Structures are given as structure tokens and as C-alpha cells.
Design a binder for this molecule. Structure first.
Ligand SMILES: NC(=O)c1ccc[n+]([C@@H]2O[C@H](COP(=O)([O-])OP(=O)(O)OC[C@H]3O[C@@H](n4cnc5c(N)ncnc54)[C@H](O)[C@@H]3O)[C@@H](O)[C@H]2O)c1
Ligand SMILES: NC(=O)c1ccc[n+]([C@@H]2O[C@H](COP(=O)([O-])OP(=O)(O)OC[C@H]3O[C@@H](n4cnc5c(N)ncnc54)[C@H](O)[C@@H]3O)[C@@H](O)[C@H]2O)c1
Ligand SMILES: NC(=O)c1ccc[n+]([C@@H]2O[C@H](COP(=O)([O-])OP(=O)(O)OC[C@H]3O[C@@H](n4cnc5c(N)ncnc54)[C@H](O)[C@@H]3O)[C@@H](O)[C@H]2O)c1
Ligand SMILES: NC(=O)c1ccc[n+]([C@@H]2O[C@H](COP(=O)([O-])OP(=O)(O)OC[C@H]3O[C@@H](n4cnc5c(N)ncnc54)[C@H](O)[C@@H]3O)[C@@H](O)[C@H]2O)c1
Lengths: 389, 389, 389, 389
């Protein structure tokens, strides 16, 4: 159980780049980071419009003199103060993640970087080498992985409760972009611009979420080959896809399927992962994150509930209220952010034992997300043929 | 509404080949055929064990002298009687469908043939030419197509309620063969024998069901290309697949996906079809056949119910009881079988107007089912590459 | 499993009174009765309009000379023929059930009587004495009790799987009469006329269905006291109720609740029964009759599926197709009607051993349904006070 | 939308009484209060064990010298400091709510009081008079009322979308106390002690939650009469009930039903409210708080989703993330707590216009909760008879 007791001596001194007044994702970063004394928001470069960034920073309780016009000034000016930031969350559009993360790491700061890490695998490999050389934590906000029942699924699979794993069926298929909403909505507009978004739309934007859930649940699984067929149903998005099918062969013969979509008309979110074994399946759906289907062949189907005593102990650690009270995605994000804070603090203290026991989406998860999108785009561009992973 | 009033002057004089005492499917054929004065069971070759076939025929109320040891004797002996059969249902294992259907057609009998029609497209084309030359009806028991809400979905799509069709997502993924049950179960045993079952297991056995539903809903849709990746997770079934992924490109750019499986551990049936348009999606699930999800992007999701006045008139014709009372797969099969009887009777009477207005799974549907399986096996055998359809 | 093999040597020679061309319930009687060689429809008094009754009888394949204008002529004329009826189903409006059932019993016929048996407990007691004196079977069409999982629930309760029973929560709450549809619909019109319907509307029409399910599941349970508060929300129905709450105390301290409604706007049927024990609950919903919720406190909830090997053997006897294929209310009614036929045939043969092992809704169930409605009306009329049962 | 911008100039200086290290509810108070700069936790009397209260306060970041041994010392010592508390949340067991709230109000502090306000209506009336005389805000943590779709339901009802309201069906029926867990669990133990808990267990503990939801949705509705039948199924709890049925007549003829239970074996929470009108019903379930069923008679059922543009504007104000991302009970509590802070700040500033537009569970809601429990206990003690409300 969590009761708000501190996990580190003092909150990590913290800034955001992006996540400004009109952003989609800025708020959940702060909601999760400020919770339970993990981080303190003392500075930021909140907006591309520096005037609006400072107006908003002040409404967030930030010193107007620590609302900087850009990330370079933020890092340089904060470095001069003994109470300067120790960590920065990057919530800008995708095109700036590489440059901002690189600069933060070279400035000796820990980073939480919005997915994706960057556009290309070569950039991802460079970022990872710079993070490791500078001994910095890089969290990546695969936020759904914060839900307790993802750890339950991992533990059940590891204990052989599904038998031998045969298939991993993943989807993130919503309908919000069935129409060309780019015309009116700035957040969608930049996501269908290859200059600002990169080589893919839905593969990178939504496909990588349930992919990361499969990596938490099946940590030893390795993709041998994949093929990807992708479409721009809203023709103006071409070459960026608003729908894709990724079929994968894992080492050992298991199969993987990822359906990525922003044109699944009527779907509110539709992020699901079903892991199918020789004995049993489990299935999780992000819109109802407090339940996990557990279906042993030839037995009654079961539903596992967040907070119940029959769960693996790893799956009960982060309960903030008793079973039957619904937790949501803010709890999942809070569960990642306190781990980010413990990892950053542990790094500063040289607490190697604590570091090694902490599990969170990190630089390595970020690299794999970029690798997968790049291989999918390579297959799709060659007309949906099998490629070596 | 249906109230049991006759649709033809007299029940079609009818026989079964197969569907004996220990069969899985024999009973639903009779339940549907005998309902509402459609067919009268007057003869049969019910079993590979002729003694057990006659024992069972007598318990079905059939004259023991009209319980014949084989289909050839059935057709020859019945031809001698003025009250001889006019039609025969073929519910034998897959390997005998071609020979029995061919003999029945050449004997001037109407046929209801269990899916699949036969193993090869060349056999299917031959059967169809013989059915047409002899002016015989061949029904095919794509039984799920008898559910009223399949016609509702067809009518909604035709009226543009989904907008332009983008994707057709189909699955028939159950878990009953997660373990090697072939060891104890004769019905599964013959299905994993290529000599008796043919070139595929789950593609032919279950994949063709939701494929046929898509052909009812999207009658003008044409597959341009497909690829199929198939697996034998129970290794002893090789080369017959217990799992398969079929990805299809339709003419006009829409995509199709079929997941066929007998190893989806914990799944009771899992036959679903989701049609996704630019405006809205619909989705139907065979285990809850009296509801149809209708999901307009940006509006509340809706559930359409069997028997309600807001349905298209085609979708209300076959209601046997008021909305809210659950109908099941026996009603769906009864809805096909009365149409089979009307078509057979209309053929005898030369009632061309009635024939042209009747919609049922016919010889042409049977040919397409065989074509699709054959193309999938061709792609799968070449390592899951795109093939022209 | 059922495979259509005869259960009695010859079909019971059978008539209907009512169930004519425009009736709601006539068809499901015939669908269930004619199935599997149980009954043969050889005569009827189908309609209050004798011309329309004969037109319809002929379309049902009945000899026009055995389409009689009334039940008295039916019984008198059939008595003269060696192939005369042996049994009659009564599907007339409620007001005529007593007179028609009494006449059939005095004529030495077995009866299947539509619920309710009659208006008053004194009439019910008289009917029962006449049925017993004449050694006749009286089936009552509590059709939902034919669903296999009702027997599963009975068996689980009897084996202590719920622990000590604490509460029985019952509802049959649909919305079809939220508006005054009596204006246009003859079936609703007679149900809100006390002269033709009797002392209650929804208590008798729908409340008695889940009440009977509780009597199957908890056969030793006895109601000690009840109170009933009833409303006419469509004011013109007064004094007949379109909504009611019945609260009951059982002997031993368990509580019962029945919500009866025709004004639950938006509800398609809403017949549910939840039995709550010290250890676990089970819950069944008529619109999804092939599943049974089984919820052990402190364990994952389970869903039990029709046709699965983990069910009690009593619950597998009536399976007509494999698990995962949806059966519906026609199967439930067919399961009662073959038992009615076996009981009638067993009575004629003096097969006391078979009779004693048969379980079906009978004269005694019919009497209890009338008793419960009468006590509820007595409480409601006294302003919803506790009455001795 | 909420983006974390301040709603008042400075966070309310805040304390808790109770909500200590081992409490069930202490954490959600702090999670909601500290969010978005609403309150600052600067002091507390956290625990009956003052040593453990101070240990925990320090882990919450509170000055050890402002971790006081009791509420009287907290109020007296804080009054001496210019940075003293302005408001206090009371999260002690029920028996101390009256004395602590009274003392806080007399000390000129705003209060958030855990439900229930107190044991007796006479105490409730006294507390309310003292709150009003001292011009203090008293929030009451009917936390479920913070869910956006409760406001959607209120707005739909007010706009006549349900037609005339006929029934209000409420339940809070969980199974966690099916067994005598009081033996091992201190939180359950005090709830079944009349000295510490008061005159009821489940009526007060859970029944009052969906009752308050009905008061938000139907603000002009007035209970004319009610009856209550209550049971102690775990006999040792007598006279405190672990199950109850409350039937109510509203002025104007609508009916209300509340099922309160801690012995609904297998239920994870089971808090539901269904409002049934002449035209349509709506239904909300606390375990899936982001959906609202909307069921127009004779139309397809609909599901309304949190965050969608078709919602009433009142129902979109508190969205913290886009539609399809699940919010939970922490958001609901955060939505109450920021309103509590705005009301307290508005009271200090004399901003009468802002005060009058704020809607939150207040002193008046607290009084009604106590009134309802007291009337239910009065009816139950007289053997479940109608009492004037
Ligand atoms: N579940 C998730 O983890 C999740 C969900 C949504 C968004 N995201 C990711 O978060 C990032 C932002 O997404 P969004 O939807 O919030 O975008 P958005 O367009 O809604 O917000 C962008 C914000 O960054 C600011 N900004 C832009 N350029 C800047 C610069 N150079 N310096 C400082 N501020 C700058 C803008 O003013 C704005 O406040 C993307 O990488 C996106 O993929 C992740
Ligand atoms: N939904 C559907 O349409 C559906 C479902 C299941 C089965 N089927 C099809 O029905 C056919 C039979 O399937 P099943 O599962 O009932 O098989 P099964 O093995 O359970 O039954 C085979 C039956 O045919 C009899 N038989 C075998 N060879 C015969 C012969 N030469 N002459 C006469 N009788 C013979 C057997 O004795 C037995 O009664 C197959 O083609 C299968 O694919 C269709
Ligand atoms: N689940 C169930 O068991 C269920 C469901 C619905 C109906 N019912 C019961 O079935 C009975 C009929 O209900 P319904 O909804 O079908 O009614 P309905 O009004 O739809 O049908 C009445 C039928 O009886 C005929 N009829 C009327 N009076 C007659 C007479 N004196 N002699 C011969 N025929 C006569 C009418 O012409 C018509 O065909 C009622 O008792 C009703 O409660 C039971
Ligand atoms: N949804 C809701 O609003 C909700 C849910 C649960 C609890 N509650 C209410 O919250 C209150 C507490 O419930 P709980 O389940 O957390 O109880 P609990 O027994 O779990 O916690 C009681 C806490 O108060 C402390 N305490 C006890 N007496 C004290 C005193 N005199 N001074 C200071 N601290 C003291 C204890 O040490 C402990 O920390 C009750 O009134 C309960 O009804 C409301």
C-alpha cells in the first residue's frame, strides 16, 4: 500500500520543457511527478510562445525568473544556482526529444522523455550511450505499464500459469482521427507531419504502448522477424499511416500481432493485450485497467481485481486505496514517477542494491520502441514483406 | 414474424448422409430442417457403421428399410419410389463431400452440403458446373448467416451508415484444441488428417465462417491480394494449422484481417466480425448473436437488439419471438433451412421471381470458401508472402 | 446430449386452445412440442375468431375438420375418435385458463397450461384436486426453468458451494410498457383489464418467472412473510400494477426481493436472479442464458458456461450442441416439453420410477405462482404491510 | 479541462485529524487536497497513538512540532501562529466527528468532515447551526459525487431527457464482510461497535453514498415516507445491520429503493444508481465511473463516455485528460477538494457570487445523510413499517 510517506529524503528539483497551457500531456506529468513528495516543480521552458510559457509557469506557482524561454537557457541558468534543477521532463513534440534529451544529459541532468525517444535507431543508440556515460536515469512515459495488473500478468507468465507462450495479440485502435481533425487540432496536426513527427504516425504514437506492455510481461522474448502493412485512410497523411498491421515471429516460434489505428471509428481507446499460452490466456484493456481476464482452457474464465490478496506481492505494492475503488491512469503514471525519483536519488547516493531492484520504463525501453517503429516502416515501405529484426 | 405456417405446399422429402448417433452436427441439421414443415426425414445413410446407422435411423422414426448402408444405395433405391427423397443433407467428414454431392446432383437431387464443399478449387468449380447443369439448389451450412442482425449489418452498410468501408476484422478463435484432444476425440482426430480433412485445419474449419459473414455484409467487395502465416502449435498436426493470420487487400484499398484459431486457450468460441467505416463501425459476436454494436465516431456507442422496430425490415422477417427473448444458433440454422426448402420447391415449380429474391449461402458461397482456403495455404506454404487472389 | 432420438414410443396426440395466427406465445409452444417427436399437432381451437382459427390450423397442417370453434367441441369431438388427442396446451388469455384446464382434466386429458393457472388460490386448489383425482399431468410454461444452468445453480446450492443462503434477489423489469401501448396492442390491452387478466398485471405476468427459478434453486425454502408495494405509473392501468417491490422473509432468516416491472424504460427484458450465500453468490440473466456468474468472496469471479465438463451432470443432459454455440429460449422450452411428454407417457404406462425422477414445472408450481400473486395483492391493497404467507 | 493552474492565490493552510499511517482513508484525503495547489499540509493530529502520529507526520513532510497529540492542542497551538491552519479534514472514526467538527468550527476553522457528520439528527442540526453562525464551509466526502458523469446525469434529468421520473434504484452492496473479518481488521471492528460507529453499520457506511448521488441528480425530490428492513447475517454484529432494504415514496409518486450490504459475497463494490423515467433510464456503476448508460425506451441503448463533446458543459469542466484515458476515484475526490478550497477562499474574500455558483457536498448534505439513517433505523426497529420522513 502507498500512504504518501516520502520514499527519498527531499523531492527531486524538477523542470518541464513543453507541457504548457494548451498541451494534452503536460498535466499528467505534473500530477504524477508532484504526488507523494517525489518531485518539486521549480523551473520550466513550458511553451514555444515564451510569454505564454511564463504566464502559465506563474499559474503553476513557478518563480517567473525560472520560467525560461528555451531548454538551453533553462539548463545553463539553473546550473548557476545551488538550488538548480536535478531532473527535467521533456513533453515537447517528437522532433525536439533528441536535442533536448541530449543537452539535458550532457548538462548532468536526469531525464523523463516523452515517447518516442527520437525518430531514428542511430539517434536512439547515441542518446543511450550519452545517458550511460553521464550516469543519468532516463525514464520513458510508457504510462500504462504503471498499472498494478501488468506486474500481476508478468508474475503469472514467469510462474508458468499460462503454460508455454504461443501468441501475443496487441492493439491500440481508437477512432478519434477517422476524420481529418488535423484541420482544427494542433496536437493531431504535428503528428501527421514527418518533419515534426518523424517516419510514422500510429506505429510510434499508439502501437509502441501495448508493445512495451508485452516487453514487461515477456522480458526474455526476442522478435526474430516482422512484417508491417500500413495505410493512410485519410489520404492527406501519406506517407504517415493512420492504420497498421504488424505480424511478428518471436525466437522459439511464438507469434505476435499489433493492430495500430487512429481510424477505428467508434473506439474510445481500444488498447488491449492478450497473451495466449498452451494452458491459459490473460487479457488486459486500458479502459478498464483494474481487471485482468485469466482464462484457463477447460475451466471457468476468471477476472483478477486490483488490490485482492490472491495477487502476486509485486502487484499489491502500489495500491493507494482498497480493492473495488477504481484507480486510473493517473495512479499508473504516479507509480512510474515515484520509481523515476527513487532511481535518480539512488544514482546520486550510489545505492546500487536499490537501483538493481527498481523496474521502470528506461532508456533501453525507449531504444526498443524506436527500433520496432523503424523496422515496421522498413517492411511497410517494401510492400509489407518479412524483415530480420 | 414466423408463426410456423407452411411456406411450401408439402415438406421436401429428405435424407441425411452422415449426422449419425455420435456426430457433432447431425442434430442441428434435423432440428432446423424438420422445423415449420420445411423437410420430412424419410430416409438416410446415417453412419459409416451401417448397423449403428439403422439403429439410429429407427430412433429418428425412419423406416428401417429406408436406412441404407451408403449414399449410392440411398440415391438408387429412393429413385425407384414415387415417395423417394427430393433432397439430401451431407454431414459426413470433409473428404467425402465432393463424391456424395456430385452423385446426389447427377441423381437429380437438391443438396445441403456441410462446409467445406471440397478440398480443391478445381473440384469446387466441377461441383458448381454439375449443380447448374442439373438445375439443383446446393445450400451450404454457413449457419451463423441465419442470425437476423447479419441482414441488419448488410442493410446498414448498403445505406452508407458506416461511411466508406476501410477495414473488415474477422476472427474465429476458440481454445478447445489447445491440448492434443485428437487422442480421445474422433471429430478432432479426422480434422487434423490431411487425407480426410484436406489442405488446412482452422482456415477451413472456422476461418471461413466470419469470411462468409463479411461476404453477406459486403457483397460487392473483391479480394485483390492476401497473405497467410499459419502455425501448428500442437506440432503433431503439421502441416495442418491450428492458428492462422490472413491479411487481405480489397479492390478500392480497404483491408481485411482473419484470425483463425483452435488454440486460443480459454476462448469458448470467439467468432467476431467488426466492419470499420470512415463514419462508424459495427461489430457482431456469435456467442451473443441477438446484439449488434453500432459505434458512430464522436457519438455514444449503441447496441442494436434483435426484434426491435428501428431495425431494417429484412432483419425483422425471421423473428420467432418478441425482442428481449434470446434466440440462438438453432434459429439461425432454421432461417437458412426454410430458405433452402423454398428455393428447392421454387426450382421444381419454375417460380423464377421467388428464386431471384431468396438470399442464402449457396453453391457460389461454397466455391469462394474453398478458393480462400486454397489461396491462404498457397501463401502460407511460400512463407506468408502476398499472392494474387 | 440430445440427438433427436425418440424418448417415448409415439408422439403424444396433441391440440392447442389459443396460440392462433396473431398470438405472441402460440409459436414457441408448437416449436418446443413438435421438436424431437414429443407431440404431434392433430387438432386445435386456435382462435376466438373460429374462421381465422381454421384458416391458421390448415396452414399449420391440421385437418380442417379437426380445427374446432371452441375447447368444449374440441374435447367432445376428439373423444369420439380412436386417434383423438391425449393432451392439450392452453395458450388463451388468463381469464379462460381455469375453465379450459378444468374441462380438459375432467375429459381425461393431460394439460400444459400457460401461466398463470388462474386468478385465485381457491380456483388453483380446485384445479390441483381435479388434476390429481383424474391422474393427469399439468405442465406450466415457466419456460426459463428449461435452461441447463438453472439445474447447475440448483446443484451448486444443494452441494453447499454458496455456504448458508442469506438473500435471493429477483427481477423481471422490462420497459416495453413505459408508454400506454394498450391503445394499439391487443396482447397488452387484455393484460391491464382485471376482468380478463385478474388481480395483478406485472406480479403475475413477469414477477412469477424469477420466483419460480428461486423455487427450482432453493426447493426446501419456505416464505414466512412478505410485503408488496405496487404502483400504476401509467395511471389508466389502476388498480393493476406496472411496477412492484416484493420483500420476503424465508423460514430460517434469509431475505427475498422481487422487482416486477413493465416500465423499466430501456430494459429489453432484465430477468435476473442472484442467490447470495455466506461463501459465494451466483447470478443468472435470461438475455444471456448460457452463462452463470459464480462469485466466491475473496476469489476471482468466475463465469460458468453451458456445455462444459466442469458442470454438474444434470446440467449437461439437455445440451443439443457443443459449448460455445449459443442455445436460446426455444431450447429451454423444448427441454420442458420433452419432459411433459415423458411424464404423460409414463402416467399412461404406470411407470412410477420414471415419473418420480422427472423434474418439471407442474400443477404444484402453478398453485404457488397464484398463491404468491394473491398474497402480494393482499399486502399492496393494505398499503404494503407484512402479511403471513 | 484542468491543467493544474491555481484556482486560489495560495493553498489553504491545512491539517488532518486522523488519517494516520495505518488508516484506510487518510491517503485519498491528502492525494486530493494537495493536488493542484488547493491545500498545504502544515500540521496534524494524525493518530490515537501520538508517537506514531508524529513519526508518520514527519514522513508526510510535516514539522514534528506541528504534529500535535490531539485536535484540541492542534487548534489551540495553531491559533497562536500567523501561519496557523485555516482548515482541517476530520478522518477519525465516526464517534469523534461531532466533537472534533464542533471544536474546529468554534475555533473559526473550515472543515472537511468524513461521512457521517455524526450519530443523531439532533447533533447534525446543532453542528449545522454552529457552522452557519461561524460562517464556515463544511465539506463532506461523498467522494463519488466528484465523477463528471454524475453532473451529466443531473443535467440530462433537469432537461427532461428521461421524461417524468418514476423510480430511483440505488445499491452499495459489496461482499468484503461476508465473514466476521472484525476479528483481524481494526477498520471493520470499530464499524460494528454502536459505541464507536453509532446506530447503524451498512446504512450509514455505504447506503448514504448512492443516496447522496440521487440528491445531486434529483435536487428537488423530497422523500415523503420510507420503510427499512435490516439484518445482521453475521449475528455478532446485532443490533448493527450488514444488509438492509430501504423502500421510499417521494412526493409526486416516484419510488426509491436502496440496497445496503457488506455481505453480497463476490461483489467488489457494487455501487450503482439507476434513474428510471417515463421516456428513458440512466445507470451509473462506481467500478466503471467513466461510462453512463442512457437507455431511451424503443431505441438502441447508449453509453455516454467521460470527456466527449456531446456531454453537458458542466460535465466537461473537470476533465484532467482526454476521453478514453480512464480517470478514477482520486480524480472524483480531487474535484470535490478544489471546490472545497475555492469555497473556503471565497468565504474569506466575501466573494458571494462565486460561493453561490459552487456545488459540492456540504453541511446540508451531511445533515440529510444522518436524517436518512436515523429514519431507516426507526422503521427497522419497529419491524420494517412505513414512517413519515
Ligand atoms: N501516453 C503517453 O505517454 C503520451 C500521450 C500523449 C502525448 N505523448 C507525447 O508527449 C509529447 C507531447 O505531446 P502532446 O500531445 O502533449 O503535444 P501538444 O502539441 O499538445 O503539446 C506541445 C507542448 O509543448 C510546447 N512546446 C513546443 N515546442 C516547444 C519547445 N521547443 N520548447 C518548449 N515548449 C515547446 C507547446 O507550446 C505545448 O505546450 C509528444 O512526444 C507525444 O508523443 C505521450
Ligand atoms: N457450423 C457448421 O456448419 C459446422 C460445424 C461442425 C461441423 N461441420 C461440418 O460437418 C461435417 C461433419 O462434422 P462433424 O463434426 O459432425 O463430424 P463427426 O465425425 O462428429 O460426424 C461424422 C458422422 O458421419 C458419419 N459418417 C462418416 N462417414 C460416413 C459415410 N461415408 N457415409 C455415411 N455416414 C458417414 C459418422 O458415422 C458420423 O455419424 C464436416 O464437414 C464438418 O466440417 C459444420
Ligand atoms: N413465458 C411465458 O410462459 C409466457 C409469455 C407470454 C405469454 N404467456 C401466457 O400465454 C397466454 C396467452 O398470451 P399471449 O401473449 O400469447 O396472448 P395473445 O393475446 O397474444 O394471444 C391470445 C390467443 O388466444 C386466442 N384466443 C382467445 N380467446 C380464445 C378462446 N376462448 N378460445 C380459443 N382461442 C382463443 C386468440 O385468438 C389468440 O390467438 C397468457 O396466459 C399469457 O400470460 C406466457
Ligand atoms: N468514501 C468515503 O468517504 C469513506 C471511505 C472510508 C472511510 N470513510 C470514513 O472515514 C473515517 C475513518 O475511516 P477509516 O476507514 O479510514 O478508519 P481507520 O480505522 O482505518 O482509521 C482511523 C484513523 O484515525 C486515527 N485516530 C483514531 N482516533 C483518533 C483521534 N481521537 N485523534 C486522532 N486520530 C485518531 C487512527 O489512529 C487511524 O489513523 C470514518 O468516519 C469512515 O466512515 C469514508
Amino acid at each position: 500500500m502507498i500512504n504518501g510517506s516520502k520514499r527519498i529524503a527531499q523531492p527531486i528539483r524538477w523542470a518541464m520543457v513543453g507541457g504548457g497551457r494548451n498541451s494534452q500531456i503536460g498535466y499528467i506529468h505534473r500530477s504524477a511527478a508532484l504526488r507523494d513528495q517525489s518531485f518539486a516543480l521549480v523551473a520550466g521552458a513550458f511553451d514555444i510562445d515564451p510569454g505564454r510559457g511564463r504566464e502559465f509557469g506563474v499559474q503553476l506557482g513557478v518563480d517567473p525568473q525560472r520560467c525560461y524561454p528555451d531548454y538551453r537557457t533553462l539548463f545553463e541558468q539553473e546550473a548557476r544556482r545551488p538550488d538548480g534543477i536535478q531532473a527535467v521532463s521533456v513533453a515537447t513534440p517528437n522532433g525536439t526529444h533528441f536535442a533536448i534529451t541530449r543537452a539535458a544529459l550532457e548538462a548532468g541532468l536526469h531525464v523523463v522523455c516523452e515517447k518516442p525517444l527520437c525518430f531514428t535507431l542511430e539517434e536512439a543508440e547515441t542518446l543511450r550511450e550519452i545517458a550511460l556515460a553521464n550516469n543519468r536515469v532516463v525514464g520513458v512515459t510508457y504510462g500504462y505499464a504503471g498499472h498494478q495488473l501488468i506486474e500481476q500478468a508478468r508474475a503469472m507468465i514467469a510462474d508458468g500459469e499460462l503454460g508455454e507462450i504461443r501468441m501475443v495479440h496487441m492493439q491500440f485502435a481508437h477512432g478519434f482521427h477517422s476524420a481529418p481533425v488535423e484541420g482544427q487540432n494542433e496536437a493531431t496536426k504535428w503528428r501527421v507531419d514527418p518533419r515534426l513527427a518523424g517516419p510514422s504516425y500510429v506505429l510510434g504514437d499508439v502501437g509502441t504502448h501495448p508493445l512495451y506492455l508485452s516487453e514487461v510481461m515477456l522480458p526474455e522474448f526476442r522478435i526474430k522477424r516482422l512484417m508491417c502493412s500500413r495505410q493512410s485512410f485519410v489520404k492527406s497523411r501519406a506517407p504517415l499511416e493512420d492504420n497498421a498491421y504488424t505480424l511478428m515471429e518471436y525466437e522459439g516460434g511464438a507469434m505476435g500481432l499489433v493492430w495500430s489505428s487512429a481510424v477505428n471509428a467508434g473506439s474510445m481507446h481500444g488498447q488491449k493485450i492478450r497473451v495466449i499460452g498452451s494452458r491459459a490466456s490473460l487479457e488486459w484493456w486500458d479502459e478498464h485497467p483494474n481487471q485482468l481476464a485469466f482464462e484457463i482452457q477447460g475451466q471457468p474464465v476468471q477476472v483478477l481485481e486490483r488490490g485482492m490478496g490472491y495477487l502476486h506481492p509485486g502487484a499489491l505494492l502500489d495500491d493507494r486505496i482498497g480493492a473495488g475503488h477504481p484507480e486510473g491512469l493517473f495512479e499508473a503514471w504516479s507509480n512510474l514517477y515515484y520509481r523515476f525519483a527513487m532511481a535518480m536519488d539512488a544514482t546520486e547516493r550510489g545505492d546500487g542494491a536499490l537501483l538493481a531492484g527498481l523496474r521502470y520504463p528506461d532508456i533501453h525501453a525507449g531504444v526498443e520502441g524506436v527500433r520496432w517503429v523503424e523496422r515496421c516502416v522498413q517492411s511497410a515501405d517494401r510492400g509489407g514483406v518479412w524483415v530480420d529484426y
